[PDB]
Amino acid sequence: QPVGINTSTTCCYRFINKKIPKQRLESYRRTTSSHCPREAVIFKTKLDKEICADPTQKWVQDFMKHLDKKTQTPKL
């Protein structure tokens, strides 16, 4: 319990325009627009490596669909 350094996440102003390793892409967490001044997507890898990617081109959005895989439960 410091004077303000909380035990939580934050934003990232790094815009990477390079290809992302689909094989190492397993999931991705998104930042909060209300608390973050710039919306960005974070890709989570198997080695706990989170890399922010500029949210503008569909290629990352396309990866999010493949990354999501399981989502809605087809209960009957």
Curated annotation (Swiss-Prot):
Keyword Transcription regulation: no
Keywords annotated in UniProt: Chemotaxis, Cytokine, Disulfide bond, Glycoprotein, Heparin-binding, Inflammatory response, Pyrrolidone carboxylic acid, Secreted, Signal
Principal subcellular localization: secreted
UniProt GO cellular component terms: extracellular region; extracellular space
Post-translational modification: O-glycosylated.
Complex and partners: Monomer. Interacts with TNFAIP6 (via Link domain).
Protein name: C-C motif chemokine 7
Source species of the chain: Homo sapiens
